[PDB]
Amino acid sequence: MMVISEKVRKALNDQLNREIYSSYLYLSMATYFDAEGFKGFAHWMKKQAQEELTHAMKFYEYIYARGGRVELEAIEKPPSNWNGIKDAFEAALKHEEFVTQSIYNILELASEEKDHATVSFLKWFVDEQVEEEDQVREILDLLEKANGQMSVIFQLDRYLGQRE
Amino acid sequence: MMVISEKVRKALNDQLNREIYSSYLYLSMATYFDAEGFKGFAHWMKKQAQEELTHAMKFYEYIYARGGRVELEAIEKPPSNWNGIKDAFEAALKHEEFVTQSIYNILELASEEKDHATVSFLKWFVDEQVEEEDQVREILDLLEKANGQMSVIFQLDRYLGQRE
Amino acid sequence: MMVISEKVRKALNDQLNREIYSSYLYLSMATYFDAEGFKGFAHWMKKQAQEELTHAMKFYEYIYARGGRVELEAIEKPPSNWNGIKDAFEAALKHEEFVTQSIYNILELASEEKDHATVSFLKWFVDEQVEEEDQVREILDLLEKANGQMSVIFQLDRYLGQRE
Amino acid sequence: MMVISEKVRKALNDQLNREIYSSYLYLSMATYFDAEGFKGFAHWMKKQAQEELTHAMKFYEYIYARGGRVELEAIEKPPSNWNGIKDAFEAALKHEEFVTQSIYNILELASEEKDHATVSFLKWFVDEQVEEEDQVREILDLLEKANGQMSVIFQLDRYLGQRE
Amino acid sequence: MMVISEKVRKALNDQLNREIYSSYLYLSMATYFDAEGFKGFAHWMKKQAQEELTHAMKFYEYIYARGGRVELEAIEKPPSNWNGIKDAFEAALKHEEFVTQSIYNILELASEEKDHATVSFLKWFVDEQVEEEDQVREILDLLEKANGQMSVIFQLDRYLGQRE
Amino acid sequence: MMVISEKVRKALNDQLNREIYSSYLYLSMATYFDAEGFKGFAHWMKKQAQEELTHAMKFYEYIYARGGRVELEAIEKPPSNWNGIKDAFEAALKHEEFVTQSIYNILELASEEKDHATVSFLKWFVDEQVEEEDQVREILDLLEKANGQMSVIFQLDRYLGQRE
Ligand SMILES: CCCCCCCCCCCCCCCCCCCC
Ligand SMILES: CCCCCCCCCCCCCCCCCCCC
Ligand SMILES: CCCCCCCCCCCCCCCCCCCC
Ligand SMILES: [Fe+3]
Ligand SMILES: [Fe+3]
Ligand SMILES: [Fe+3]
Ligand SMILES: [Fe+3]
Ligand SMILES: [Fe+3]
Ligand SMILES: [Fe+3]
């Protein structure tokens, strides 16, 4: 039987679906970059999309480990175009900060319910979000320095296209 | 410039989104098998979901190679429950036969337009569909022979849980 | 259930039986070459007979993959006497060209029915028949040049006897 | 020149053709097992068909070694269906016992003619027939013990499917 | 004797000669890049010329495999001057798209004649042309982004000069 | 700036174009040998065609090293048929002797102009032409000894077909 509350189960399932959307949004940013011919930025976003799916499956396996079940929900259509390289990465940063706040909300729900197992499980994501946000902020700072000069933006398309 | 027609680009983009849905459907079947305690069947379905993502990305890269762009659409909520193991695999077979017909329709459209590049590209998917349909039919035949015997269902769950 | 039509299943089953006969014909050619004391030509024909069985089994496995069944039919007695070495290889070429036309007829039937899976499956055989015909044409050209000279025919016997 | 009698040559050639039919019969049993969805039993029968061809070719090479020639005859249509797994293997046992008696008849004929070379050649087949018959009896014993339990028949299908 | 029609043989021979011209055109592009001091772009074009010769020899061997013969025709003088790097690669792209259409025309002729062997042979070039066009489009996108900045064009010259 | 005279540059460019024609001529001889069924002689001629391209590219790189430019000219249609194997190799010998005299004419022009760099560059070709002529003379001597004797011509075809 399920040892998380239905309310914590719902919060975790909601977050799983949010991570699925995150993966889909980053794939959409990849489609935009590929349409604009930045094959390295697109590669970076495809890798990010794969990473978000691993987040979703961590939520999946935790839900089942606590006796719950996962219900997949409809996936909203992501935006398909951005008003520039900066516009896309600013959207990514805004999205990741929203994901961080969502995880925070689950953590406090679990803590109020004295569900220490879920509180502890979420630590990994708190720490991971620190890094996700930082990587996007670093990219945005580089884009600010480039100031639209393609001499430099070529170098950064090439470097992010190196992501493993 | 785009060297596929807009109608062929649309058909290919539609199929990419269909493959994304397929992946999500197989993930949902995994949520069902895991809820029912069949971790080997669930494992098989997670592997199948990943395979469907590789199909989607094959369409993605071909579309860009012909000068088109991809637009991701909303993904419909899949079913979450089946009336038993057979019911789920029968749903999988019906879905794969629908995917095959979808591929056939693109092939016939591209052939009507004398788009030999797209006709040739689609051959890989025709052959792959033969294999996917056959593997599900094989599982259904084994389940029919098992006739609900848990000894045999345990053995098959093991076997499918070994999928690489 | 069977997802090829009965007319296509019958065409494929007919061709499987045709490939069995091909194997048997080449074994009969081996009996002739061995009776004439050309063990290298006989070796080549025994290898060709084994190759034809691999063709039959490719049809076999495709038929089952599409939900059909194979029915083996009577095997006609092959000829056992030829006028000479070149006449045997000329008969081989005529047989392979007949096999190619038989395959073409299946492809055109499948295409009429929009059975794209079977059309795609048969491509391997179209390409292979090009090679089968060409290898016999090459041997026939060498035998025409030899012009019955037993010195040269012995060299060709030793060379064909090296077939792997 | 031929140093076997024509009667012994005919007996050996008749047996070569019997071995060709044996191979074809076992391939037909494979068509039945594959239609019934027992891919391991079918695999065993495909291996047996290849073994029977090695028997035919041992007769072939001996006939030529004694200065005779081989004449291939029409091959009769084998049965395509059996009333079940045990029915098919009972047919296989009856066939192999008929093959053994046929070999015995050649041996007795050659002995009457004081053709010691052929009597000695046939000892390999006498000994091999002991093993062929015994392997079928062992499978029939296993099927008798299984008594139609699919739990056990799955085991036997996988075990026979491991045949090298 | 020839098993392609004279019309299909002439279409294939015409294409072989077109592939020879393609090779010569790319060598001429190398003469331009070397005159402009871009040794890496020139290296890329020398490698491309060699690849075009392999295309010509594939047509050569297929014509002979179907019993035809090759007749080499005069090769027209290629252009030797372009208005810049991007202009040369735009010419390469236009040339490759013309080559693709030429191949399509042969494919449609062969299909009209039910020459399934030749249609199938041409599939390889259909797929290869997809790749050739895409590789030139990728180079054109890089040159577009470079926007005449010699900093980037030096790097691109080195990179293309590494072609194996 | 160009440090060869225009007259020497034109002589070298003319010779580069002559070497291209040489390559094409030897490919045409290959088309003849393949039409006649002598795949070893054809192989030898294909290897010779590639060797002539290496000659052309040695002229190419020297022209650029001295500040000149290469202009590729139209290639004349080579003969496609010869009155036999010996006729083809006699034509090859006559061609190579013509090439040697052409190189000599460049050397004498450069010496008149005291262009010691070009005189020295051409020594490699003087020495190479000695070998080019000698290998064809050797083949012609073998063919004279063979005297149309097909037994011997087979041996010569296989030997020339081993060319690396
Ligand atoms: C290389 C880009 C990968 C594609 C990312 C797609 C993002 C949206 C996909 C929707 C979800 C589909 C189901 C995926 C389940 C994966 C489960 C296996 C373990 C990761
Ligand atoms: C040493 C060379 C051996 C050549 C043997 C070729 C025999 C050809 C006879 C064909 C007709 C009988 C076919 C029987 C079925 C064989 C199935 C084998 C694959 C499983
Ligand atoms: C770096 C080398 C570049 C050389 C390109 C030359 C293209 C000129 C075309 C002329 C054709 C001559 C015949 C060549 C036949 C070669 C056949 C064998 C090799 C595939
Ligand atoms: Fe995430
Ligand atoms: Fe798929
Ligand atoms: Fe065949
Ligand atoms: Fe036997
Ligand atoms: Fe090409
Ligand atoms: Fe030369």
PDB file of C-alpha atoms in Angstrom, chain E residues 5-120:
ATOM      1  CA  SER E   5      17.441  -1.531 -72.584  1.00  0.00           C
ATOM      2  CA  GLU E   6      19.498   0.708 -74.848  1.00  0.00           C
ATOM      3  CA  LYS E   7      17.509   3.678 -73.517  1.00  0.00           C
ATOM      4  CA  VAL E   8      18.399   2.879 -69.902  1.00  0.00           C
ATOM      5  CA  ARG E   9      21.990   2.051 -70.867  1.00  0.00           C
ATOM      6  CA  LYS E  10      22.314   5.458 -72.541  1.00  0.00           C
ATOM      7  CA  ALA E  11      20.783   7.210 -69.527  1.00  0.00           C
ATOM      8  CA  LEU E  12      23.284   5.483 -67.235  1.00  0.00           C
ATOM      9  CA  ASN E  13      26.207   6.237 -69.569  1.00  0.00           C
ATOM     10  CA  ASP E  14      25.079   9.865 -69.766  1.00  0.00           C
ATOM     11  CA  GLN E  15      25.094   9.982 -65.965  1.00  0.00           C
ATOM     12  CA  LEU E  16      28.573   8.426 -65.782  1.00  0.00           C
ATOM     13  CA  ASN E  17      29.829  11.206 -68.055  1.00  0.00           C
ATOM     14  CA  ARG E  18      27.956  13.764 -65.923  1.00  0.00           C
ATOM     15  CA  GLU E  19      29.782  12.413 -62.812  1.00  0.00           C
ATOM     16  CA  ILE E  20      33.100  12.811 -64.657  1.00  0.00           C
ATOM     17  CA  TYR E  21      32.171  16.427 -65.355  1.00  0.00           C
ATOM     18  CA  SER E  22      31.221  16.911 -61.688  1.00  0.00           C
ATOM     19  CA  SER E  23      34.688  15.733 -60.696  1.00  0.00           C
ATOM     20  CA  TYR E  24      36.248  18.127 -63.191  1.00  0.00           C
ATOM     21  CA  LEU E  25      34.096  21.040 -61.991  1.00  0.00           C
ATOM     22  CA  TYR E  26      35.210  20.505 -58.406  1.00  0.00           C
ATOM     23  CA  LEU E  27      38.843  20.356 -59.524  1.00  0.00           C
ATOM     24  CA  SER E  28      38.204  23.702 -61.257  1.00  0.00           C
ATOM     25  CA  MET E  29      36.798  25.062 -57.995  1.00  0.00           C
ATOM     26  CA  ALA E  30      40.039  23.907 -56.379  1.00  0.00           C
ATOM     27  CA  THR E  31      41.993  25.871 -59.002  1.00  0.00           C
ATOM     28  CA  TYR E  32      39.986  28.945 -57.985  1.00  0.00           C
ATOM     29  CA  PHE E  33      40.442  28.423 -54.231  1.00  0.00           C
ATOM     30  CA  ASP E  34      44.184  27.847 -54.683  1.00  0.00           C
ATOM     31  CA  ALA E  35      44.458  30.997 -56.814  1.00  0.00           C
ATOM     32  CA  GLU E  36      42.704  32.867 -53.971  1.00  0.00           C
ATOM     33  CA  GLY E  37      45.051  31.368 -51.359  1.00  0.00           C
ATOM     34  CA  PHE E  38      42.504  29.176 -49.551  1.00  0.00           C
ATOM     35  CA  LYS E  39      44.369  25.890 -49.499  1.00  0.00           C
ATOM     36  CA  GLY E  40      41.918  24.176 -47.139  1.00  0.00           C
ATOM     37  CA  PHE E  41      38.876  24.912 -49.307  1.00  0.00           C
ATOM     38  CA  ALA E  42      40.970  23.771 -52.286  1.00  0.00           C
ATOM     39  CA  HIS E  43      41.788  20.523 -50.434  1.00  0.00           C
ATOM     40  CA  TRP E  44      38.088  19.970 -49.772  1.00  0.00           C
ATOM     41  CA  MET E  45      37.364  20.375 -53.483  1.00  0.00           C
ATOM     42  CA  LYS E  46      40.173  17.966 -54.496  1.00  0.00           C
ATOM     43  CA  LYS E  47      38.686  15.370 -52.130  1.00  0.00           C
ATOM     44  CA  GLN E  48      35.236  16.057 -53.607  1.00  0.00           C
ATOM     45  CA  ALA E  49      36.574  15.511 -57.130  1.00  0.00           C
ATOM     46  CA  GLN E  50      37.951  12.119 -56.083  1.00  0.00           C
ATOM     47  CA  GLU E  51      34.586  11.191 -54.515  1.00  0.00           C
ATOM     48  CA  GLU E  52      32.792  12.116 -57.787  1.00  0.00           C
ATOM     49  CA  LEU E  53      35.103   9.713 -59.621  1.00  0.00           C
ATOM     50  CA  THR E  54      33.985   6.924 -57.274  1.00  0.00           C
ATOM     51  CA  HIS E  55      30.363   7.798 -58.254  1.00  0.00           C
ATOM     52  CA  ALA E  56      31.308   7.522 -61.941  1.00  0.00           C
ATOM     53  CA  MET E  57      32.911   4.114 -61.350  1.00  0.00           C
ATOM     54  CA  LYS E  58      29.796   2.822 -59.579  1.00  0.00           C
ATOM     55  CA  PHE E  59      27.821   3.601 -62.746  1.00  0.00           C
ATOM     56  CA  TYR E  60      30.633   1.992 -64.791  1.00  0.00           C
ATOM     57  CA  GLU E  61      30.507  -1.285 -62.914  1.00  0.00           C
ATOM     58  CA  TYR E  62      26.691  -1.433 -62.924  1.00  0.00           C
ATOM     59  CA  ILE E  63      26.538  -0.930 -66.714  1.00  0.00           C
ATOM     60  CA  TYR E  64      28.977  -3.777 -67.247  1.00  0.00           C
ATOM     61  CA  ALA E  65      27.158  -5.940 -64.671  1.00  0.00           C
ATOM     62  CA  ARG E  66      24.001  -5.681 -66.818  1.00  0.00           C
ATOM     63  CA  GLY E  67      25.870  -6.577 -70.011  1.00  0.00           C
ATOM     64  CA  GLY E  68      26.286  -3.046 -71.337  1.00  0.00           C
ATOM     65  CA  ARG E  69      29.405  -1.101 -72.248  1.00  0.00           C
ATOM     66  CA  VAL E  70      30.611   2.404 -71.397  1.00  0.00           C
ATOM     67  CA  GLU E  71      31.436   5.076 -73.977  1.00  0.00           C
ATOM     68  CA  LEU E  72      33.325   8.101 -72.669  1.00  0.00           C
ATOM     69  CA  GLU E  73      32.249  11.402 -74.224  1.00  0.00           C
ATOM     70  CA  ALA E  74      33.943  14.793 -74.475  1.00  0.00           C
ATOM     71  CA  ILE E  75      34.033  16.741 -71.165  1.00  0.00           C
ATOM     72  CA  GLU E  76      33.033  20.439 -71.413  1.00  0.00           C
ATOM     73  CA  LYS E  77      35.354  23.153 -70.036  1.00  0.00           C
ATOM     74  CA  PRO E  78      34.109  24.083 -66.537  1.00  0.00           C
ATOM     75  CA  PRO E  79      33.955  27.616 -65.205  1.00  0.00           C
ATOM     76  CA  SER E  80      37.175  28.635 -63.457  1.00  0.00           C
ATOM     77  CA  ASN E  81      36.087  31.877 -61.698  1.00  0.00           C
ATOM     78  CA  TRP E  82      33.596  32.676 -58.915  1.00  0.00           C
ATOM     79  CA  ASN E  83      32.810  35.982 -57.191  1.00  0.00           C
ATOM     80  CA  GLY E  84      33.926  34.606 -53.835  1.00  0.00           C
ATOM     81  CA  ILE E  85      33.954  31.569 -51.613  1.00  0.00           C
ATOM     82  CA  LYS E  86      30.196  31.470 -50.987  1.00  0.00           C
ATOM     83  CA  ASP E  87      29.500  31.926 -54.685  1.00  0.00           C
ATOM     84  CA  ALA E  88      31.597  28.850 -55.454  1.00  0.00           C
ATOM     85  CA  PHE E  89      29.801  26.753 -52.846  1.00  0.00           C
ATOM     86  CA  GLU E  90      26.398  28.028 -54.027  1.00  0.00           C
ATOM     87  CA  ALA E  91      27.422  26.825 -57.491  1.00  0.00           C
ATOM     88  CA  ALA E  92      28.366  23.468 -55.969  1.00  0.00           C
ATOM     89  CA  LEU E  93      24.932  23.183 -54.343  1.00  0.00           C
ATOM     90  CA  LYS E  94      23.139  24.077 -57.581  1.00  0.00           C
ATOM     91  CA  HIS E  95      25.253  21.525 -59.429  1.00  0.00           C
ATOM     92  CA  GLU E  96      24.436  18.776 -56.925  1.00  0.00           C
ATOM     93  CA  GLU E  97      20.708  19.518 -57.079  1.00  0.00           C
ATOM     94  CA  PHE E  98      20.945  19.229 -60.881  1.00  0.00           C
ATOM     95  CA  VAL E  99      22.739  15.887 -60.436  1.00  0.00           C
ATOM     96  CA  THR E 100      19.941  14.733 -58.147  1.00  0.00           C
ATOM     97  CA  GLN E 101      17.332  15.636 -60.762  1.00  0.00           C
ATOM     98  CA  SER E 102      19.347  13.791 -63.438  1.00  0.00           C
ATOM     99  CA  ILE E 103      19.351  10.686 -61.231  1.00  0.00           C
ATOM    100  CA  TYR E 104      15.605  11.090 -60.600  1.00  0.00           C
ATOM    101  CA  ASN E 105      15.054  11.164 -64.365  1.00  0.00           C
ATOM    102  CA  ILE E 106      16.904   7.882 -64.804  1.00  0.00           C
ATOM    103  CA  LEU E 107      14.919   6.368 -61.929  1.00  0.00           C
ATOM    104  CA  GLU E 108      11.620   7.400 -63.509  1.00  0.00           C
ATOM    105  CA  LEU E 109      12.701   6.027 -66.889  1.00  0.00           C
ATOM    106  CA  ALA E 110      13.699   2.683 -65.357  1.00  0.00           C
ATOM    107  CA  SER E 111      10.445   2.492 -63.392  1.00  0.00           C
ATOM    108  CA  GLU E 112       8.458   3.133 -66.580  1.00  0.00           C
ATOM    109  CA  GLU E 113      10.257   0.139 -68.155  1.00  0.00           C
ATOM    110  CA  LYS E 114       9.792  -2.063 -65.053  1.00  0.00           C
ATOM    111  CA  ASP E 115      13.602  -2.261 -64.783  1.00  0.00           C
ATOM    112  CA  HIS E 116      13.468  -2.927 -61.060  1.00  0.00           C
ATOM    113  CA  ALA E 117      17.187  -3.746 -60.907  1.00  0.00           C
ATOM    114  CA  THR E 118      18.131  -0.252 -62.124  1.00  0.00           C
ATOM    115  CA  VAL E 119      15.576   1.537 -59.915  1.00  0.00           C
ATOM    116  CA  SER E 120      17.021  -0.352 -56.954  1.00  0.00           C
TER     117      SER E 120
END
